[PDB]
């Protein structure tokens, strides 16, 4: 699983000591976050399940 | 200008955030997601 974005965090003092962090900027260009899985492994995995069912 | 699934997903935004002083505010540009903001009805 990955969040493939090169990002930038900025900081702003909002109170006498209260300084929070926020999602400032993205370097590169915008990419979806996703997850991979071996399909044939998972069908073989799920084939074991239904036998137990 | 984006065709992918990420279109209309990240939103540039603007503030008037209170600074550390009592009578000083601040216009702040930031980024947010669809699943964090709600429309009210540059809306």
């Amino acid at each position, epitope marked *: 699983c990955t969040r493939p974005n090169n990002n930038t965090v900025k900081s702003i003092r909002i109170g006498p000591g209260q300084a929070f962090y926020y999602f400032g900027d993205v370097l590169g260009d915008v990419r*979806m976050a996703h997850c991979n899985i071996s399909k044939a492994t998972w069908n073989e995995t799920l084939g074991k399940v239904v036998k137990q069912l | *200008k984006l*065709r992918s699934m990420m279109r209309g997903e990240i939103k540039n935004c603007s503030f008037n955030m209170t600074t550390e002083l009592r009578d000083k505010k601040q216009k702040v540009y930031s980024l947010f997601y669809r699943l964090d903001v709600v429309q009210i009805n540059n809306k």
Partner: antibody
Amino acid sequence: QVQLQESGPGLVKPSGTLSLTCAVSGGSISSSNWWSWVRQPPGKGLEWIGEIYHSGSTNYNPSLKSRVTISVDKSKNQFSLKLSSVTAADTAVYYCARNAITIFGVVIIGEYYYYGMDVWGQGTTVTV
Amino acid sequence: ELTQPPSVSVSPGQTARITCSGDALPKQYAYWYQQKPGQAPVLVIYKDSERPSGIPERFSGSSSGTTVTLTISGVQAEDEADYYCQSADSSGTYWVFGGGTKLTVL
């Protein structure tokens, strides 16, 4: 290079279907781009018509969604520009077309840039 | 679907500014072409600001809301050709063309 040769009928009887074919020289239509058709009436500007992907996904002019259907002969690296009974209102020069794109990220979610339409056809003076 | 000024004439040494208008332009890119006479029309500007390789830097491009701008800085007399802007649907389904642009230098 990939060269676009155009093919189809010649002088056209009015209100007839016009199936046309782009002989893609250097034909390597794997899945890499979009392919499409545009046209130019002989004293006017251009007119976008339709668009196809290799898998069979097609796009069309909504102004010409009825009378226009397209396909592809990947067995011969050829295209299909088919029409319905189109009158003599469309006696236009016809262009074989290549929407080249640029794969940005994951191709399945459609994360790519339309590069500019790269390589043109030849010019098909269809007289109806 | 797209508005385009049909004819803009200049003198040499100027800077040409050609626009197109359209409602999908705040959501779609716009691509620029150059029909030289009797020629295959050449890609000029992609992604609203990018020229490809083999293109001189005289050609510039920018967007403004529902308006775009084709920019030719330091106009030469041999650049007299047609210029077509291309975008697509608001839904991003079908492509459309601009009307037309005729240059006349000198």
